[PDB]
């Protein structure tokens, strides 16, 4: 849904602790401002992407203190109060399975506008709206309905007659509870399940690591250190060596901002898809084949993850 | 008497839905809502 | 329904005739297009390490061979200023194409149809949409049904009658607290629970939370008045 | 006749088959024709 926000002091990356290099960097004009406008346009939309996916709920819906859901046991996916952040049991698996020297090069990482607690509160309201009121909170005010009577409406939505729920309701509840059991066990045991979210964190880290490594490169200058060039050469020869480092560093920044702009378009397409799965699979029931998992869609439960969303899609097979 | 303030943002009005194993809410009326969407 | 539609289109005129900022998504595109050309004209004023930013100040002052060392600086910096503009525009054009492919899909599914996709054609249950054009964009007026004034009712998954369990054909069972009705799911309009509103399956023992109420059979009183019609015909025939 | 609808005749549908179709109104009237008949047979007595 999002990637890390970054910004750079283009003058500190290229020319950190050098008045001479800073006075030569003025020969290139707008480029250092234009790089910062690009990284800001990316950073502003990471908050947009997150808010378009999670903030689809008008009110912070709460579950009742009595959990009479007709045998369906949501306790693995609902908020757990005995925590500093009220995440669910499955959300605290997801937050552990993704694992997350640059600063003094003028590079910095900006916080997201919504904290992980606020993403968990929106997810709690989407889940507590869904299990107390069905799709009705997506299309008006939340109107309560009993959960087994909602699941009968969902059975009619897949073309199955509603007595096939009420006459089999204990089997359907046990199969749901056993299937949510297997979600925990899979996520706990298996490393590669969150590979999509770890790959975004790994691409951000490899990009900043490569950006900092390009400071050690000569670009054909006599040293990669501005103080060596400025101590060993006079004004008119040092200004020829410093310009090689300015030219190569400024291309090292322009390459980072281009791969970040290109990668931000992939994350936006994924956030727009995740916002559509939130609207159509969580706030509704979907007739779109294979869109909300394999089978005939009954319903979906959102869970938050580090820089992403997890949908637990429930289907009749 | 004006100033800049700083605050933790609210996520929306809070709501306990009146769920029970035998209660349903049914709308006795409707509104027609026209809403504008702008796309490049 | 017509007066609510006419009042809702009235509020679109009032909003667009009032606020300065409603088309901010389209003004952002114009502002980005204009800012990129104004930035590209500003990069002409830069020296890139040449003695001047102006070729006429190099070609009037330097000879044919000392000029080329200055001219190549200006060529190198400008050529990078165009490759930056065109890379920004190729990336930015893919943002606008993704939005044009969405707007073409809202034209097909919201205007040329009625969408069942939730929140695709406005916030509600979609009725229809009307397209309006704008500078470099499209505006969809999405018309939606929003349910407005709910009442709480008691409810049941089934009704139990002759030991048989009855379920709604379309609708849901509700009670006002003393009588049982069947009603459509999205608007309170109650009916007596008849054999034309319900279907049978199995016996009352298998459904969790089933309730006892009578289920009316509309054929029965039309046969029972046929039983009074028969009985008075026999009473008349006793006379001779 | 409650699960099914009718249109046309057996001559047009490729692969149509023969089976009885129950009319739930038929025994509901035939058990009423025995309610006619037993009331008539009683009224033979006076
Ligand atoms: C639950 O719904 C019931 C149906 O609306 C309602 O019962 C109905 O009550 C009205 C009076 O308020 C009765 O109306 C009739 O009253 C006399 C009967 O002799 C006539 O002179 C009138 O013309 C009129 O027809 C209905 O007969 C009665 N219907 C039934 C099926 O009993 C309940 O009062 C409602 N309960 C609650 C708590 O809302
Ligand atoms: C819904 O309607 C059902 C049918 O009338 C009713 O079931 C009947 O309930 C009564 C009272 O509990 C039972 O009465 C008999 O119970 C046992 C034998 O089963 C005897 O020991 C008692 O002395 C008494 O005679 C009926 O036998 C029982 N009938 C059936 C077919 O189950 C439900 O209780 C009703 N439910 C509600 C909540 O009203
Ligand atoms: C489905 O049921 C139909 C009704 O019983 C049946 O139609 C009947 O078919 C037989 C055999 O074709 C006909 O028998 C007559 O055939 C000729 C006249 O067409 C005579 O020379 C014979 O002696 C004999 O009487 C029936 O007349 C015909 N009835 C009707 C009303 O058309 C279908 O054949 C059955 N189809 C299948 C696949 O079982
Ligand atoms: C639907 O009912 C709920 C609560 O249950 C009701 O409680 C009684 C007041 C009575 O109506 C019973 O028949 C029901 O069992 C209502 O929720 C309450 O709303 C008030 C404000 O009106 C609020 O002060 C309470 O805290 C709420 N209590 C709970 C438990 O939610 C709700 O307003 C009713 N909705 C409609 C549309 O009538
Ligand atoms: C819902 O499922 C959870 C298991 O995922 C049940 O919680 C366990 O209940 C047993 C019996 O009391 C305890 O020994 C465990 O320690 C519980 N585990 C956790 C993670 O809390 C829960 O009881 C089920 N709910 C209902 C109503 O049956
Ligand atoms: C329908 O399939 C379910 C399983 O998907 C069957 O339920 C299992 O039944 C066996 C005994 O037949 C038990 O050992 C299992 O514990 C049951 N599983 C669950 C989750 O309850 C069910 O019997 C099948 N029904 C029919 C009519 O075939
Ligand atoms: C359904 O809601 C509409 C408004 O959304 C109600 O219509 C209004 O009714 C009041 C009197 O009760 C009038 O003063 C208004 O002028 C009406 N507005 C319109 C647009 O006509 C309507 O009465 C409600 N119906 C029910 C059955 O509750
Ligand atoms: C609903 O819950 C109540 C307790 O609040 C219980 O007495 C009742 O039997 C339950 N009914 C159903 C249909 O589960
Ligand atoms: C008896 O029924 C006959 C019709 O069979 C009718 O003509 C006659 O008026 C009736 N008379 C009485 C007294 O009911
Ligand atoms: C089906 O195929 C068989 C041959 O396997 C053929 O005899 C029969 O007439 C066919 N029936 C229909 C309804 O096409
Ligand atoms: C026959 O009809 C008389 C009334 O005329 C009634 O009293 C009697 O019970 C009936 N008997 C039978 C066997 O239906």
From Swiss-Prot, chain C:
Q: Which residues form a coiled coil?
A: 27-71
Main function: Subunit of the fusion protein that is processed upon entry into the host cell. Mediates fusion of the virion and cellular membranes by functioning as a class I viral fusion protein. Contains a viral fusion peptide that is unmasked after S2 cleavage. This cleavage can occur at the cell membrane by host TMPRSS2 or during endocytosis by host CSTL. In either case, this triggers an extensive and irreversible conformational change that leads to fusion of the viral envelope with the cellular cytoplasmic membrane, releasing viral genomic RNA into the host cell cytoplasm.
Upper lineage: Viruses, Riboviria, Orthornavirae, Pisuviricota, Pisoniviricetes
**Segments for region (Heptad repeat 1):** 1-48
Disulphide linkage map? 110-121, 160-204
Glycan-modified residues: 152, 176, 212, 236
Q: What is this protein called?
A: Spike protein S2'
Looking at the record's lineage, which domain of life comes first? Viruses
Which consequence is recorded for altering residue 59 to F? In strain: Omicron/BA.1
């Amino acid at each position: 849904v999002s990637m890390t926000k970054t910004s750079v002091d283009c003058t500190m990356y290229i020319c950190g602790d050098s008045t001479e290099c800073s006075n030569l960097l003025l020969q290139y004009g707008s480029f250092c401002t234009q790089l910062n406008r690009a990284l800001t346009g990316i950073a502003v939309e990471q908050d947009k992407n997150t808010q378009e996916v999670f903030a689809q709920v008008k009110q912070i819906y709460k579950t009742p203190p009595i959990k009479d859901f007709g045998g369906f046991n949501f306790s693995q996916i609902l908020p757990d109060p005995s925590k500093p952040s009220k995440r669910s049991f499955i959300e605290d698996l997801l937050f552990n399975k993704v694992t997350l020297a640059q600063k003094f090069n003028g590079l910095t990482v900006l916080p997201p506008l919504l904290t992980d607690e606020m993403i968990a509160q929106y997810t709690s309201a989407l889940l507590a709206g869904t299990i107390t009121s069905g799709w009705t909170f997506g299309a008006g005010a939340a109107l309560q309905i009993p959960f087994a009577m909602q699941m009968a409406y969902r059975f009619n939505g897949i073309g199955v007659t509603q007595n096939v729920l009420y006459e089999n309701q204990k089997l359907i509840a046990n199969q749901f509870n056993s299937a949510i059991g297997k979600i925990q066990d899979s996520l706990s045991s298996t490393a590669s399940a969150l590979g999509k979210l770890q790959d975004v964190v790994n691409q951000n880290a490899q990009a900043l690591n490569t950006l900092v490594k390009q400071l050690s490169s000569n670009f054909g200058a006599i040293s990669s250190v501005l103080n060596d060039i400025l101590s060993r050469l006079d004004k008119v020869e040092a200004e020829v060596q410093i310009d090689r480092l300015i030219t190569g560093r400024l291309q090292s920044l322009q390459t980072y901002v281009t791969q970040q702009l290109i990668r931000a378009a992939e994350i936006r397409a994924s956030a727009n898809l995740a916002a559509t799965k939130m609207s159509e699979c969580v706030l509704g029931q979907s007739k779109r084949v294979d869109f909300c998992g394999k089978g005939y869609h009954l319903m979906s439960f959102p869970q938050s993850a580090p820089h992403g969303v997890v949908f637990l899609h429930v289907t009749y097979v | 008497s004006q100033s800049i303030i700083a605050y933790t943002m609210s996520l929306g009005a809070e709501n306990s839905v009146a769920y029970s194993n035998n209660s349903i809410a049914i709308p006795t009326n409707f509104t027609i809502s026209v809403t504008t969407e702008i796309l490049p | 329904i017509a007066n609510q539609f006419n009042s809702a289109i009235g509020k679109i005129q009032d909003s667009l005739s009032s606020t300065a900022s409603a088309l901010g998504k389209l003004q952002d595109v114009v502002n980005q297009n204009a800012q990129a050309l104004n930035t590209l004209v500003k990069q002409l004023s830069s020296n890139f390490g040449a003695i001047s930013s102006v070729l006429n100040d190099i070609l009037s002052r330097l000879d044919k061979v000392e000029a080329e060392v200055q001219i190549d600086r200006l060529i190198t910096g400008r050529l990078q200023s165009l490759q930056t503009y065109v890379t920004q525009q190729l990336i930015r054009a893919a943002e606008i194409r993704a939005s044009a492919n969405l707007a073409a899909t809202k034209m097909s599914e919201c205007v040329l149809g009625q969408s069942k996709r939730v929140d695709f054609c406005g916030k509600g249950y979609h009725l229809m949409s009307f397209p309006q054009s704008a500078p470099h964009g499209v505006v969809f007026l999405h018309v939606t049904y929003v349910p407005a004034q709910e009442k709480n009712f008691t409810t049941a998954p089934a009704i139990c009658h002759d030991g048989k369990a009855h379920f709604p054909r379309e609708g849901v069972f509700v009670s006002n607290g003393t009588h049982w009705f069947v009603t459509q799911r999205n608007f309170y309009e109650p009916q007596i629970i008849t054999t034309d509103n319900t279907f049978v399956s199995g016996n009352c023992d298998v459904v969790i939370g089933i309730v006892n109420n009578t289920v009316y059979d509309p054929l029965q009183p039309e046969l029972d008045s046929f039983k009074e019609e028969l009985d008075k015909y026999f009473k008349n025939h006793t006379s001779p």
